[PDB]
């Protein structure tokens, strides 16, 4: 429930992620005194993330993993602006994800494996680990599938409203479009720029 929450801006320091599991969650870990639990927060009016309570991060600091700092090109100890976000107001009607394209790459070149990766299983894992989260094009993620670490970049996103029988909306590559993941989004996996994932 996002109806009521303190929208005041806060300047927060970027730091190393507390540990690997939180990075695998891809969620801004915040203290209870910073922001409520399980709400979408925007950072610099571009980068949206879900907040989860974390006692290991003091109030006034925001935790990020490597891929997010690659997405925004941030440094450690660099200050960022954080505010409340309301995608439903911003988009109006296109609140869901209809079709999402994901480039998959090997994080480590020496960890190339000839295994046959099931796209359905990847979609199930993406949906299982990530529900009701806001994603944008060029946003990066680290995925753990069968012990194998992958970098996922959302090359393009299509935003559709509930009730649209056909996806007549144009697929947008611009970072402006954002949507909410659902149990029916068409996930299309493409090879990464390295082109090593089979």
């Amino acid at each position: 429930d996002m109806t009521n929450m303190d929208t005041r801006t806060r300047h927060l320091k970027v730091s190393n992620c507390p540990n690997n599991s939180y990075a695998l969650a891809n969620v801004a870990a915040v203290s209870p005194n910073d922001f409520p639990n399980n709400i979408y927060i925007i950072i610099d009016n571009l980068f949206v993330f879900t907040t989860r309570h974390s006692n290991d991060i003091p109030p006034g600091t925001i935790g990020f993993n490597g891929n997010q700092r690659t997405w925004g090109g941030w440094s450690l100890n660099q200050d960022v602006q954080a505010k409340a976000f309301d995608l439903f107001k911003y988009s109006g009607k296109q609140s869901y994800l209809g079709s999402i394209d994901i480039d998959i790459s090997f994080r480590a070149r020496g960890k190339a494996v000839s295994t046959v990766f099931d796209q359905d299983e990847l979609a199930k894992q993406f949906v299982r680990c990530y529900e009701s989260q806001i994603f944008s094009p060029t946003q990066y993620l680290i995925m753990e599938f069968q012990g194998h670490f992958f970098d996922l970049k959302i090359r393009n996103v299509q935003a559709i409203d509930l009730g649209d029988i056909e996806p007549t909306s144009a697929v947008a590559t611009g970072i402006e479009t954002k949507g909410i993941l659902t149990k029916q989004t068409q996930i299309n996996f493409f090879k990464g720029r390295d082109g090593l994932v089979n």
Binding site: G66, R69, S75, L76, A108, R109, G110, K111
Partner: protein, 146 residues
């Protein structure tokens, strides 16, 4: 005390020694913070240009021995942008290659890079020492993944 006296050269000599003893003692983050001060104190000074490349390299090396490859990459980018002499230098290329090897978890590649760099600019005892810990960290990660 030299820095209070505005004697930049003597201060830099002392901080080179201090940051170097700190890196050999495993205090790599604090050594990097002194490699950073030396960098700022030496920017724009034509007399320190040769030393400046050296400082950038050492900073990255400490950041690689602290397993913070991201900071090493940032130091490389900073040096490439701020000092053209460092941009085209063998030291910058060497630091890039070391960062790439650390990211790939390939200790043998980093060994090849060290030997190549040794052929053209001898690695003094300090660089060999720090590089050996970088190697050990990569190998330990490989073994932990096994």
């Amino acid at each position: 005390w030299y820095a209070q006296d505005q004697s930049v050269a003597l201060s830099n000599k002392c901080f080179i020694k201090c940051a170097d003893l700190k890196a050999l003692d495993g205090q790599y983050i604090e050594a990097s913070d002194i490699y950073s001060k030396l960098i700022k104190s030496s920017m724009g000074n034509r007399l320190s240009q040769w030393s400046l490349k050296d400082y950038f390299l050492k900073k990255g090396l400490c950041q690689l021995a602290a397993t913070d490859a991201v900071a090493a990459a940032r130091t490389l980018q900073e040096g490439q942008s701020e000092d053209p002499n460092f941009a085209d230098s063998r030291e910058s290329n060497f630091l890039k290659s070391l960062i790439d090897a650390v990211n790939e978890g390939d200790s043998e590649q980093l060994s090849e890079h060290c030997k190549e760099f040794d052929n053209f600019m001898r690695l003094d005892k300090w660089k060999i020492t720090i590089l050996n810990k970088i190697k050990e960290s990569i190998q330990q990660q490989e073994d932990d993944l096994l």
